[model samples]
Structures are given as structure tokens and as C-alpha cells.
Target chain A: NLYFQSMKLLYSNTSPYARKVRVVAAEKRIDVDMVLVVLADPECPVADHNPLGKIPVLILPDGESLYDSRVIVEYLDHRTPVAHLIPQDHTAKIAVRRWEALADGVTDAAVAAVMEGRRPEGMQDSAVIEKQLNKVERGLRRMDQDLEKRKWCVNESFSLADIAVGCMLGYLELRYQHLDWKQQYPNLARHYAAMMKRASFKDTAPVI
Target chain B: SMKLLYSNTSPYARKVRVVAAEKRIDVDMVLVVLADPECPVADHNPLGKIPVLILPDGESLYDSRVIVEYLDHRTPVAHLIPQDHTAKIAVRRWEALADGVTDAAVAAVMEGRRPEGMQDSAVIEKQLNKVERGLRRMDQDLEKRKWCVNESFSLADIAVGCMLGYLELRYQHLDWKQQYPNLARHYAAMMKRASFKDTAPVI
Candidate 1:
């Protein structure tokens, strides 16, 4: 196994995907050097780590870089035995990954919405925007239904699924506050609140 | 031990299906039409995409790439992932490139499906440009290299094969064969595999 201290995380505070890594690392008690990237600057340091110029790139020891939030969290979980974010059993692992995918899908759609909205008004593609918005709406409903009477996202435990879902919910609040998901889905709101009580959530919450 | 919620035309689903075939794992496939709103894709995955592998314990794993990784761990028959850290990263990077091309290609097709007036010319152009860039990268990486990872046939080859296969299915006019001979040869070799032959594209 590689030395954990050699790891450095490239991130922007505003990125929920990056925050997911921070949360996971905190839970696992893994020490990772935090390197903030200037996202707006053309010379953002993230490019050297991730070709896509995206944040949340984990620079592993030996100069290898692991990317996006999903891969990084999985790596961290494996690197440490402190907190088992992902389950070992095949059935349980699938359940956790399913929740992660759904959560990531919604976040991806929301990111698309924000990107499209930034485009010039006349040039904006309403069709694409509508498609993305529909995804977010349906995604939230799915989350609500899944959490109707459950404390966590999957397997009735505080696993990676909850961490992934938490980051997405926090992101929607950060970027799309106009989306009052709290009123529409009290179940999700309660789960989000449960996640907030954790120091991992509080420490990584984006001030932006 | 599991059921795969799959769509016949989706390249994403094909990746997972190919993995299952390679591992010699018997999996029941439930076909779902992506265009239909009432499809049970949402029952397994809220994003409603295909290739959601439903475990025997009532759990569904999704996004073709993830499902393939999970299935790779199921049996040791044909290890798709590398053991060495660098080799593993190379394989993963190749998979990302292949999957990225598919993402753009699929997006371009979806944009074309939109009403003429509603279609975004810029979006279509950008996605096409992305596909072209990805193909150039793939071609250069395959320089005198048999497999995408420059090692034994691994997940990298399977991924790009599925990608090239998708381009052949949807955009046959691209003429990728004449442009990238190395990739073409590589694709041909992959086709020889029983896994590839069994999952041949319908079109």
C-alpha cells in the first residue's frame, strides 16, 4: 500500500464533488494535503492533475492522479480500514453504488443546468435545459421515495451512499437555493439534516 | 445470480453485458426501451439509464462502467483490470477516454433528435469536435500497441471496442476504419473474442 501522506487533493471550495472527498477523508481520518484550485483563472492548477480541468483530482503517490469524486472516494475507502464507506458483500456493494450513481447523476444534471444558464440568453438551448431540469426533478423525487422511512440511503447504514447523496443535496442548496427541495421533500430534508450533524458535513460545507 | 436491466441499442449497457459474457457469469437480462417513459429503468436507477445490474439481493448497480468493475471482481476467469498501480491507472484512463467519446457521440445523436428549430448548433458541433479529438487520442495511443493499455487485452480494449462499436452502429458514415487503421485492426482483433461475437450489434 502507498503512503497516505503523499496524497494531495486539488479542489475548489464551491465544488461539492471535491467536498465529497473531503468528507470521506475526514471520516476515514486520512490526512490529505488540500490544494485549492482557482477555477475561473485560465491557469488553474487542476488542469495538470485532471485533463478535463475539473476539480477533486486526487494526486496519489508516485505522481499518479485519480479523478472525479467517485473514483477518489473508492480509493480512499480502500486505502484505509478506519471507515468502511463501501460494503464488502456483493449485494450490499451494489446497493451503495446504485445510490452513488443516482446522486451523481442528479449532480451532473444540475451542473449542466448551471452551465447552460451561463450561456448567452439568446443562444441558450431551452430543450437541453428542460431535459436537465426534468432530470433534477425526477432525481429528487427518487431520493424522497427511497428515504421515505429509512435513516440512510442504502443498507440502513451511514455509508458512502449517504456521503455521496449528502454532497449533491448540499450542492443544490449552494447553487440552486431557489429550489426549495426542503418543502417538497421533507424526507430528503430530514436526511440532509442528519448528515449535517456529522462533523464531516460541517467541516466540508462550502462557504461559497 | 443477478438480472441486468439493459437496452439493446445503448453502448453503455453493452459494456456491462460484454463483461458478464467474459466472466462466464450467467445473468438474466430484462430489456427496457429507453424511449418509453414507463420503463422500469427508474425502478432500478432514477437516472433511468440501462445496464443496471440487479443483484440477487434486490439491489441494482448502474452506469455501465461501474457495473463492469463490479462484475470484474466476481470471478477470476478473465481479469480485466491490471494489478500494478500504473497499469491500472493506464487501463482506467483508457476506459475514461473511450467512455468520454461515447458520451459525446450519444449526446450529439440526442441533440440531432430534437426538433430542427430547437436543436443547438453549437452543442452538436462541440460534441462532434469532442468525438474527433477522442478518436485522435485513441489512435495515437494505439501506435504499434496491440491493446489500449499496451498490455494484455484488458478493460481498456473492451471499453474502446464498445465505443468504436457504437460509432459503427450510429454513425457509420464517419468512416473511422479508413482514418485509424491501428484502431480498426484492434477492433477487428476484439471482434474475434467470443464475448464480442456473441454480443454483435444488431444494426
Candidate 2:
């Protein structure tokens, strides 16, 4: 297995998607060199790995790169049996991936809303921002309902689902603190609290 | 067997339906109008998006990526995804690139859907830049290759096929066929497939 080979990860501290991959690497006990990059840079190397120019590209030792946070996390989980973030069973694996997709969907909306608000004064659109934040609101409610009593997102285990949700929560905390999700969804708040205690979450916390 | 909640015109939904057809899997396709306030999509997916695959057990798999993976794993008939690790990455990366382009295109289309005065030229321009760059990259990488991967038809082709189809359906003004002849030719070949022809999006 090439799991033992050292790899390089291109990331930006403020990107929750990149943070999710970082947490997965830490949990999987994979030694990855974190190469910080600025996506806004016209000369950014991310485009070399991912033509999309998106963040969190994992460059395998063979110079081949993997991307989009979901794919990278999957590659990491399957590379070794260490953390075993994803499930083995067919049905169970889909459940975890579904949760990850849900969480990532929420993050995508939140990021869209934030970026819209950042547009120069008159260029911003409240309608667009409202629509995006509405998705975030509905997604938060769905997550809360799904996690009503379970400690983790799926199968009651600390899987990639939790990592994705935690990263989404972290991004909200960083960009949309006004969301007050903690007061609104106590279950998610509790889950977030538990997630923050992990060394992986703590070290890779989102920042400006 | 599973039920796929989809809208005929959604590119993302088209991708999953295409995957199902390519795999020769039987999926009960349920059409849903996204504008409906009480659409069942909200019940299965928090994002209220289409292409949510409802498993036999009533568990819902969503977002096109997750649903496609589930469908791919259901049977080995076509093996859209590669089993080899590196090949798998290559295929998935192409899928990502195609999906990314579709995302930008969808965003641009949605911006146009907004009222005329409300449209943001800068936003549309930014998204269009992404689409242009993505197509350029796809064209450059696809040079002289019959398939997206190493001489084999995979999910990569399915994704690019669906993405190009969407552009043809909605962005007729783009004239991408003239700008990127390689993609145009590749997409034309993909169009010959029963799967792509069957799930094509329309207004």
C-alpha cells in the first residue's frame, strides 16, 4: 500500500473543506505535509492539482493529486485501517457519506452567503444571501433532528460524518457567529463541543 | 432497487440518472417540482435538492455524489469507477472537475433567474470565468483521448457528458462547441450513448 508514502496537502486555514481533510489525516494517523496556499492568488498551484482551483488537494507521493474534500477524505480512510472513519458495510457506508454530503451542503451554502456579503457595498444582494442562509437554517434543523439523541452522526461512531459536521460548525463559528446555532440546536452544540476536544479538531480549527 | 427523486432539468440529477442507466440498474425515477414548498425532497435531503436516492429500507442517500457512489457500488455490471487506487483518483478527479464546472454554470443560470435589475454582472462574470477555465482544462486534458481516463469509459466521461449536455441545454449563447471543438466532439460521441440521450435535460 502507498499509505506509508509521505504526501503533501494544499490548504488554506480559513477553508473548512481543507480543515475537514486535515482532521481526517490527523485521525487516520497519516503524516501529511500541510502546504498552505491562497486560492485567490492568480499564481496559485491549486489549479495544477485541481483544475477547478479549489482548496484541499492531496498530492500523493507519486505526484498524483486527489481532491474535493469528500474524495480526499475517502482516499485517506481507505488508505489505512487506523481511524476507520468510514464504514465497511455497503448500506452503512452510504449513511456516513450521506451525512457528510448534508453537512458539506450546509457549509457550501454558508460559504456562499458569506462571500455574497463580502461583495463591495452596492454589489451585494440580500436576496441571494437570504436564499443561501435559508438552506443553512433548514440544514441545521435537519442535522439537529437526525442527531436528536445520538452522540455521533451515523452508526453512533466517530466517523467522517462527525468530522464533516464539525468542520461545518467550525465554519459557522468563524463566519456566521450570529447564527446562534448553539442556542437553537442544543444537540449540535453538544456535538460540536465534543468534537472540539479532539486533538485533530483543536489543531485544525478554522481561523481568519 | 431504489427510488431516485429528481427533476428532469437538473444537471446534477441528470448525472445520477445517467449513472444508473450506464450501470443498467433499475431505479424508480420520481419527478419532483423543486419550486413546490412542500416537495418531498425536503424530507429526504436537508438541502432540499433533487437526485436523492431512497434505498429500499427508506434511508435516503443524497447529493449527486453520494447517490452516484451508492449506485456504482450496487452492481459491478459497468464498473463506472475504477478499482485501482490511482485510477480511481484520476476518475474521481475528472468527475470533480466536471461537477465543479456544472456548479459554476448553475450558479450563473440562477443569477440570471433573478429579476433583471437584481442580476449581478460581477457574479455572473466570475462564474462564467470558472466555466471557461474548466472547459479549457477539460479540452486540454481530453486532447486526442477517446475517453477521459486511460482508454476506458468511466464515471469521468459520464460527468463530463452530463455537464456538456447542460451547457447545450441552457447556455446556447456560449457557443462552447466553436470555442472548444475537442469537448464538442467528445460530447457528441457521448450523446450517442443511450444513457446520455435518455437522461438529457430540457426546459
Candidate 3:
């Protein structure tokens, strides 16, 4: 019998960023012991590993932590040959990473909107929320237009780009159910449907 | 010629500019005033962000992170990223740390820009605290180091330099120079590079 040591992954179940890392790890068949965290807590342990106090910090076997989700996913993707989420070629890699950034940018806006809405009713800035929502809408439109006839986000292959897009869509579904993106972007809807069939996506579905 | 759509005040854009300058890559800088709804940034990045790179083929790359990654690979003259996997991760980690500080500072500044009644003190305070925390962590990690990672000038230094430059540009009251002498020394050394001097953020 062989024993395997798993790395520690600080994450929140509902964080889309964390979900992306989880999906990447699952796809690569990497062993990461999930450590739940409440990011809002001032004493959250995530602060110990990541000064940013953000979740999805991956603590390597050597005890050094990798963070910010994007970095963590890159580390996980390279840990094994089980799945190559990121491309090797420079041009192909840039394309995939660009798509990932686009998807994450939209999610960042949506998260901003949600945070603004959570402020005290009297202090809430409707204009700020509106601005963030507008960014979300524009981002969704771009994603939809780009995905029109493509099965995967880049190079017509299953890559981290698709994983990012799928995670963004799942996040929208969780927080912005009012968005009507399914009807508005049939292509994304189709792609999301296909993405859900993958064990990586299914196992790491975002939950409250 | 490759066109770089950027804002003069964005540290993220400055990072890309500094990378290009260090690599000796010639790119036509197209200034985009983010406040103008008519600015061309939206055409390239639907999120309406700066630091978008338009390739010769007319394809646009964005969000600073991706653009810098592309530029690092565009030329063999200066490799900002380490070729070794573990070393590369260390370099990127420093970049992320530096970028995280900039993110927090930007958030605080944005909050302060809101109308008096609309501004959320809690949000601003939290953002400022994060900025301080990030800076403290950075100081601890730096602790008399010549460079951010691998003891060489890499993307990590570029990112950290941009962040410190942005702080100086927007938060003159911070007094980070006295508090973190190592970082101050680091910034002084970075200023020696023409790339850093050329891309200093303007109003």
C-alpha cells in the first residue's frame, strides 16, 4: 500500500474563484484537502497563508502557499500529466489565458455588485451597483459572441478557458438568477450544458 | 505596429509598459481616458478596462495579466519569467502579491472618489487595511532583498515597481518610504532602470 500526502486548499464553497481551482485540481486528479473558510471573518486562517486574505490558497507539500486562484490553478495544472488545462505553446497559451481573464473579470464585476448591494440600505450606492452590473452585461455579451460557434473557448479543445467560462456562468446562475443569460446567449447555455456533464464541473458546482 | 490601449494612471498598464520597455518591444501607446464612455477600450475589452494589447493581427489581449504574459513570450531578448517551473511560480507569486497591494489601493481610492454620502467608510477602511497588510507582508518578504524573486530582474520586480509607483502617485500621505526602508531602497534601485522611469504613472 502506498500513502499519498495531499496539499491543503483553503476555499469557500460559494467562491467562484475557489471553484475554478477545485475544478482544475479535479481535472488533473491532484490530491488537495479542502479547508473551508469564511472570508469575511477578520481572523480567517486564509490570511495566514495569503496576505490578500483571499481564498483558494494552495499550500504545497513544502508548506509554502500559492494563491489568487489563477496562480493556484497554474500550479495544479503542472503538478501532473493527467490533464493539461493550460496550453504549452506560447500563442495557444495566451489565447487560453486571455479567455480565463475575461471570464474572471466578469465574475469580479458580479462579485462587486453583490458586495455593494450588501451594504447598509441607506449607504448602498445604486449607481455603483449599476456600473458593475453594466460591466457584467457587457462581459456576458462578449463571451456569448465569442462562443457563438465554438464548442470550447480556445483552440477548439477542452481547456482551462472553458473551465473559467463555465465557472463564471455557474456563478451568475447562483447570484444573478434574474440575468436571463440562458435565453440571451443560447451558445453559452449550450456550452454550459455540455460543461456540466464533465465530472470536474459536476463535482465542484458552486453552492451557498 | 502593435497598439497598447492604456490609461496613464493605471499601475496595471504601467506594468505592461515597463515590461515592453525593458524587453525593447516597440508598441504604439494609445491613451484611453476611462471616464469617457466613447473611449475605445470597450471595443477591445468589453469589461471596459485599460491595458489592452492589440496584436499586429488585430486581435486584442487584455486585463494586464494576459498582456504581460504575452509580452514576456514575444521576445527572447529579456525573459521576465523563469524557465524552471518552481522558480516561475515564485516569480508569479511575487507578482500576485504586488498586484494585490495595488488592487487594494485602487479599491480604497475608488471608494474615496464616490460622493460623500455614497462613500462607504467600512469599505474604504477595509480596503486600506488590506493595503497596509499587503504592504507589511511585502516588506517582511523583501527584507533587504535585491530583487523580488530568483535574485534577478523579472516580471516580479516590474509588478512590484509599478505598485510602489502607483502608491507614490496617489497616496503621498502613506509615508511608506520611512516605514519600509527595504522597499524604499528597492524602489530606488528600480528607478535606476529607464523602463521604470519611463512608465511612472501620470495624473
Candidate 4:
């Protein structure tokens, strides 16, 4: 009885957060109007709608804006009738959500480190950046160990947890490629590579 | 002893304290001021963030969001999160968005306090934009819904309310109440709760 007549994706080509939502939409077979926002544009139209100026804001058909990748993905999962991106079971669902939170946490730390590094050379706080990087590494190791026995992050089917982790990994590749995450964790490397083969992932790969 | 290392000025700490009060979970409160660079908070949380929950088992949980989730999971009282999977995810997502808004707001306030010559307008603007967008989204989401997710009171509402209250205390110029009628109404309702009233920022 309900259908999304029109939806628009407010995004930046370089934002892995935005890409995560795009991948979810593609997986669910939900058509979206993609509106790319350039970060450098002085008059970025996206900001006019969302004060946060962050991308991957979803404009719903009913004229409501949903945002930050986590919320947008949940809304999409609910809108679609097919395979649920989240598990139905309580424990499994919580586990999946926890994994997603950890992955997103890694992204937040890594991004903060990157932003700190962009400061004027002398003003840059290596200590702060290093601390954040440590969290990212520790998070990656924990995730790698957690996924050692399973193909997916949570249950048998791919869930939002997978999208969250994959996007973080992709972000690392785009911004911190020198870290060499793949060499350190062979299992995650294999998992990420396998995920890239999916049409949704391939179509929404972040291109900075 | 079960203790919470917290700062009175932190909204994140306030959220935990509110939850503890609501669930009647007693905890010894230790003031760990962030302004003191030598504080031992870093020994527990590498990020040096406040509101670190020190469990009776001596295990520590950093990140307010994670700590709150763990608290809800371990508590024996009425569940703050819905038992239904869809409802749970929906509430968690709302919490994340609200928490993210607070994160940006904190960043903005910090940036504004930085020495004029050293401050980056772009960074401050970015965070400000995020806070505004998050509020707009919350307003839109609350259009037809009485609560954040389910029919009852949940962690999502608590988190969002804490965030709004924090914004009011820190950045009064935002005028969020004037912009979002639903949020204003919700904030008024949340303020009436004993937990929220009891935990009002004590400087």
C-alpha cells in the first residue's frame, strides 16, 4: 500500500558514508535521485537543506530529509519489502548493530586523525592523530578476528553491519592508503575484495 | 565499587547519569575534569573522553553510545530499548543521529573558543552545518510520530533530549526551539521527567 514515489540522495562522490547508503539502495532495488554535492562549492545547495552540510542526506518522497548514513540506511531497509538488511533475531540484530557501531567508530577516529593532520604542519598534533590511528587499528584487528569464522559480519546474509565496515575500509583506502590495512589483515582483505565484487558495492565505490 | 568517571559539564556524562537514575542503577560518581590535562581518563579511554563506565567487574567501556547500550543490555529493570528487532534498530539509528549531532555541536563550540587567528572557519562552519541538519532531520522524523521509534519512551528519546538540552546550555544562539516546534514540545515533555530534572547541568 506504500511506495516511495521519488527519493533524492544528497551526497559527495568522495564520502564513503554516502556510498554506503547508495550501496544499500542498489541492493534493495530502490531507485533514488542522486544529487552530488561538491565539498568546495561555496554555495553548496545541500547545506541549505541540511545545516550539517554532511552528505548522504536522503530526501524522502514525502519531503522529509533523513540523514547521517546510519539513519538513512535504516529508513531504506524499512521502506523495502525484500531481504531485510538487519537480522530479525534479537541477539543477532544487536550483534550486527554493535558491529556497525564499531565500524563507524573506526571511521570517526580515522577521519579525525586525517583532519588533525591537515592542520598547519607545526600546529598538527601527531600525538592526537596517533591515538586515533591506534583506535582504528585496534578496531580493524577486532573486526578481522570476529569475522574469521564467518563470511558475513553478523548472520548468513549480508547485513547493514557489512556495509558499515566495508565503507570504513574503503575510506581508509581512499584517504590513508599508506597504512596498508590489507597486508596487516588478510581475512579482512579477502572479505573486502569479495564485497567489492557485489554490483551494489561496485556501483557506489567512493571516488575522490 | 561500581563507579562512573564523569565531568559535570559534559552532556554525554549527563545522559549516562540520567540512565543510571531512570533504571535506579546506583553508581559512585567521580569527577574527572577534562580541563585537567593530567586526569587519568586517558588511562581508561584512549580518546580521553568523559562518561567512561567502570563496571563492577573492573571492565571499562568508552564511547557514551556503547556504554549506554551495554548498560541497557545488562540492566534488570524495564528495558529502555524495544525488544522488537525493527524497533530496536530504528531507535539505535535515532540515537546515533542524535549523538552525532551532539558531537558536531561540541566541535563547533570548541572551535569558537579557539584563539581567533588559529581558528579555522571552515571547520567551525562544517560542524555548525551538521548540527542544524541533524535538528532538521529530527524535526522531520517527529512530524507524525509521537516518539522516536515505538509507542513508548525509549533510549532514542532520551538521547535526543539530552542533545537538545546540551545545545540549549552551550549554544543558545542556535534558536532550535523556535525552528522546530515538535522538538520544542518534546524537550518540554522530557524536562518534566525527574531524571532529566535531577541531572540538569551542575556547574
Residue-level lDDT of model 2, residues A50-121, one tens digit each, is: 767788899888877787888888888887888779998877788898889989999999999998888666
| Stretches > 4 Å off in candidate 1 | A1-6, A38-41, A45-49, A123-131, B55-58, B82-93, B115-125, B132-145, B148-150, B170-182
Worst 10 residues of 2 chain A by lDDT: A42-51
* Ranking of all predicted structures according to lDDT, beginning with the best and ending with the worst: 3, 2, 1, 4
DockQ of each: 0.36, 0.63, 0.79, 0.31
Q: For residues A47-128, could you state the per-residue lDDT of candidate 4 as single tens digits?
A: 6545566687888777666767876887788777787887766566666666776787788888889888898754556676
- Provide the TM-score, chain A, model 2: 0.94
* Cα lDDT, model 2, residue A187: 95
TM-score of chain B of 3: 0.96
Can you write out model 1's per-residue Cα lDDT over A104-135, one digit (the tens) per residue?
Answer: 88998888888778765565677677888787
Which is the winner by DockQ between candidate 1 and candidate 4?
1
How good is model 3 by TM-score? 0.96
DockQ head-to-head 1 vs 3, winner: 3
Residue A115 lDDT in model 4?
85
Question: What are the interface RMSDs of all the models?
Answer: 3.2, 1.9, 1.1, 4.0
> Candidate 3 overall Cα lDDT vs. reference?
0.87
Per-residue lDDT tens digits of candidate 3, residues B176-201? 98988878988999999999998886
Query: Clashing pairs in model 3?
Result: none
Q: DockQ rank, highest first?
A: 3, 2, 1, 4
